[PDB]
Amino acid sequence: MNSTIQTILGHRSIRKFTSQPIDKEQLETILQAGLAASSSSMLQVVSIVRVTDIEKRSQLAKFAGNQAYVESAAEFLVFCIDYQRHASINPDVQADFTELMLIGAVDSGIMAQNCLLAAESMGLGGVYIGGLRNNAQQVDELLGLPQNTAILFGMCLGHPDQNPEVKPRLPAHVVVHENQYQDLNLDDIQAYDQTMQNYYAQSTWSQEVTSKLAGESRPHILPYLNGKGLAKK
Amino acid sequence: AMNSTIQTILGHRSIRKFTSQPIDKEQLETILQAGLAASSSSMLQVVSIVRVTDIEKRSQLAKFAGNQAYVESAAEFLVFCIDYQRHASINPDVQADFTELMLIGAVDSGIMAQNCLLAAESMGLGGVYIGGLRNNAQQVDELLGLPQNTAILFGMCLGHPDQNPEVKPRLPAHVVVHENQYQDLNLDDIQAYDQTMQNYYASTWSQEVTSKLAGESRPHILPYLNGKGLAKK
Ligand SMILES: Cc1cc2nc3c(=O)[nH]c(=O)nc-3n(C[C@H](O)[C@H](O)[C@H](O)COP(=O)(O)O)c2cc1C
Ligand SMILES: Cc1cc2nc3c(=O)[nH]c(=O)nc-3n(C[C@H](O)[C@H](O)[C@H](O)COP(=O)(O)O)c2cc1C
Ligand SMILES: [Cl-]
Ligand SMILES: [Cl-]
Numbered sequence: 394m395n396s397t398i399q400t401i402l403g404h405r406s407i408r409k410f411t412s413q414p415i416d417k418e419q420l421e422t423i424l425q426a427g428l429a430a431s432s433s434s435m436l437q438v439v440s441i442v443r444v445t446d447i448e449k450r451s452q453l454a455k456f457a458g459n460q461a462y463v464e465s466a467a468e469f470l471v472f473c474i475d476y477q478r479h480a481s482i483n484p485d486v487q488a489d490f491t492e493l494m495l496i497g498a499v500d501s502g503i504m505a506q507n508c509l510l511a512a513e514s515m516g517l518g519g520v521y522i523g524g525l526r527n528n529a530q531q532v533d534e535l536l537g538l539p540q541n542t543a544i545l546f547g548m549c550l551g552h553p554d555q556n557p558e559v560k561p562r563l564p565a566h567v568v569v570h571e572n573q574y575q576d577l578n579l580d581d582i583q584a585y586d587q588t589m590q591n592y593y594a595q596s597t598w599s600q601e602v603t604s605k606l607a608g609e610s611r612p613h614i615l616p617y618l619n620g621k622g623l624a625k626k
Numbered sequence: 627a628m629n630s631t632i633q634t635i636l637g638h639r640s641i642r643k644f645t646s647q648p649i650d651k652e653q654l655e656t657i658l659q660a661g662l663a664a665s666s667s668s669m670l671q672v673v674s675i676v677r678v679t680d681i682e683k684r685s686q687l688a689k690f691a692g693n694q695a696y697v698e699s700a701a702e703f704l705v706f707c708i709d710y711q712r713h714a715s716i717n718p719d720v721q722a723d724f725t726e727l728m729l730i731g732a733v734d735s736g737i738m739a740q741n742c743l744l745a746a747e748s749m750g751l752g753g754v755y756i757g758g759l760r761n762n763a764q765q766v767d768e769l770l771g772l773p774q775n776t777a778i779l780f781g782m783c784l785g786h787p788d789q790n791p792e793v794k795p796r797l798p799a800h801v802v803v804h805e806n807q808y809q810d811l812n813l814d815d816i817q818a819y820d821q822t823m824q825n826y827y828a829s830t831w832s833q834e835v836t837s838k839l840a841g842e843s844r845p846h847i848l849p850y851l852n853g854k855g856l857a858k859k
Contacts, residue, residue, distance in 0.1 A: 442804045560669070
């Protein structure tokens, strides 16, 4: 074994926190972990907004779809794509290529996952909040983001006050392909649907996820990004 | 606040030179298991991994990544992909062409990849992300036989390290982390960091990153994604 692996494998989203704050030294370490993430071309295109102002916390909770743990978490971090630093160094920077939004999205996930694992390694718990993107522009303006930047997701951190079971995922032989993409075996989806309702014990996982994707998935996001100068071509 | 997870995170270096020693089957199983334990937006599970063991494809991928020889010499090479094809194979009604979903695919891929890499690093392995595959995304896509609704994002080399670089410094936290609202860049923080990086090595950092972003960044990538059915609106 080792403690990093058991930390990774014991992951659960935590959505209920005690009122205990996170020590100043733990938070410094969590952010230090984030900053040690790999970075495409060393561009360093991620910014983090730490929200301590409780009026802003309450507004973010509402913008995220009334997720109360946005308010009650000890800390709330907002991960943002940031090409404003670069444009402030050299205004010829071309930040509107879709490639650069891919980079900002991937690098944000890498950094955020270092932050979360570092926190979980210390007995803390957390959850990602993609719900900020429901009202992306309102969140953007609330945190004062300039052009060439955009919100991607938030992250709640705190001392956990709940003990969920680990949720199973699709098996590695479904998700991992050897040398070339393998067509899906629908029997593996049926076996996994069974695993999920065992976990949850009417819609099965397969019906829920494809029900969600049959509709429109935040169709305001490309205009939002375009409005900040991003993903225009 | 210091355990071996934190120690692994902060001790991270990109490794680009590997010994010939293979990775044990048990270790690779654990690395992939660690990736599968990552958070997933809405439990969509939008990520696939192609593990490339065929040496001719390894050679081709090395070329397509920009002649990066460690693609070929790494013990294992993993290609991370956005995957909405599992969902469309479940229900052809799924709408996978929203930009929102490429965004989810990219973030979730970085989260999963970083679980894999940290797991590897915790075992004394090393590795490096290979975004260079996107230089030739379409040819890489055809080589791995990806269907519609999937797209490569980046690769990942893993192996037993045969170099030990020093840990490379990042922008300071007080530049990257903002309290409550976005903060303007102080160009003297860039000047300081430019000197910190010049020491690390011997164009400054800021000249190199901006002059790179002054050009076009992989302008073929939006057509690449659109040709796979993604990011069209
Ligand atoms: C990018 C991203 C955004 C997320 N956004 C939310 C959110 O807005 N609200 C929420 O409750 N959970 C959110 N989650 C948490 C997922 O629902 C959770 O990871 C998933 O259900 C699997 O559960 P687990 O993390 O406990 O293993 C998000 C996860 C990711 C990766
Ligand atoms: C998304 C992504 C793609 C990357 N692609 C490459 C690559 O193609 N070639 C390479 O040598 N390094 C690649 N890297 C590694 C970066 O060059 C590296 O993280 C940074 O320059 C080096 O800092 P480090 O030693 O702290 O990781 C990539 C990193 C990320 C996050
Ligand atoms: Cl957690
Ligand atoms: Cl890259």
